[PDB]
A and B are shown apart, each in its own frame.
Chain A
Amino acid sequence: MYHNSSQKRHWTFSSEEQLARLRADANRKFRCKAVANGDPVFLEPHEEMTLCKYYEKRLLEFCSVFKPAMPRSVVGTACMYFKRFYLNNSVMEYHPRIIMLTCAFLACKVDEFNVSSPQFVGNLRESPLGQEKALEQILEYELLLIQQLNFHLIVHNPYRPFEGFLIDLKTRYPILENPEILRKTADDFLNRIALTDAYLLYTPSQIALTAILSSASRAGITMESYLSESLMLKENRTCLSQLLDIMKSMRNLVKKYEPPRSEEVAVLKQKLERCHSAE
């Protein structure tokens, strides 16, 4: 369960500043290691973040058309794996294209989605020899990824809390006559929430509740009494204020998110390929 999970204990961070510090530390550590080992070829932390967002989108696309049909829990686990890995690692050291496939592979294993390695690499849009090489790279990086996750493999996603909240709304909140009308829109917000760092900063229950209440807000429906009455937050005013602040910060995170730009990602991909070819 989340309330005593490794995700809550170790992989939920206090602020975006802490995440930026971790990523800058990873970038500077790679720079120091390369200087001791081996220039403007180096990537900046914001460039690394842009490439990480692009390859998270690529991982989403790969998991979307994966045959057999990938459970959404597996996709969430793989995306969280990617985020956690590149919290403490530089894309110039470990290429995101292989790391994301390793994340998908490990997530398939962890979430008990039985898919054989040949049919895992058959989903790749590459030649059979390319698929074999990619399989070899994934097998090389599997233990590396597991080590960099600190052997914390169970990932608590917001989908089951979303289902539980929908059940609770259907049962105890008749004011919202049909909570199902909130699903689609809320799901959309969930996806957008996944694009930010919210998964490293907020609980899955908070993320699901924020998605549902934002869907209600775009629907023109106020369910403040659901927090107040149903969740008994009228008793704890500070708890209600903290929850509302968490949701507002989450919405601000979504509104401040910027998609990677195609020219920027092309230039940064050239720089990343130069980094991997060199050193």
Chain B
Amino acid sequence: ALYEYQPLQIETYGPHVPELEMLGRLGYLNHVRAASPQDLAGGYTSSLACHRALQDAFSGLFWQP
């Protein structure tokens, strides 16, 4: 009985959202406001806002009631 990680498999009914760490590489972070040094010190990054916005944009796009 050994634990083994498995990512949460929750259907979003929409286009796949790019990974949080790859947002900068793919060029997403060039279109969101940069976090201030105080925000970075608190642990808030613009990647969080961009990821949340993309997830909300793609959530349930393909869903039918």
Contacts and interface: CB of A to CB of B under 8 A. Distances in A.
- State yes or no: do A and B touch (Cβ within 8 Å): yes
B2 to A, nearest CB: 30
A231 B58 CA distance: 9
A168 B57 contact: yes
Interface of A: 1-4, 8, 12-14, 156, 160-168, 170-171, 201, 203-206, 208-209, 230-232, 239, 242-243, 246
A217 B65 CA distance: 26
Interface of B: 10-16, 26-28, 30-32, 50, 52-65
A230 B32 CA distance: 20
Given A171-B27, A239-B62, A4 B57 contact: no
Contact of A164 (B16, B55, B64): B55
A176 B27 CA distance: 16
Closest CB pairs A-B (n = 8): A164-B57, A164-B53, A203-B60, A170-B31, A160-B56, A205-B61, A161-B57, A2-B59
Contacts of B13: 3
Contacts of B54: 164, 167-168
Contacts of A165: 57
Contacts of A166: 31
A8 B27 CA distance: 31
Nearest to B16: A232
Tell me the dominant secondary structure on chain B's binding face.
Answer: loop
Nearest to B10: A4
15 contacts: A3-B12, A3-B63, A13-B65, A160-B52, A160-B53, A161-B53, A164-B54, A164-B58, A166-B31, A167-B54, A170-B31, A171-B28, A171-B31, A203-B59, A246-B64
B60 A8 contact: yes
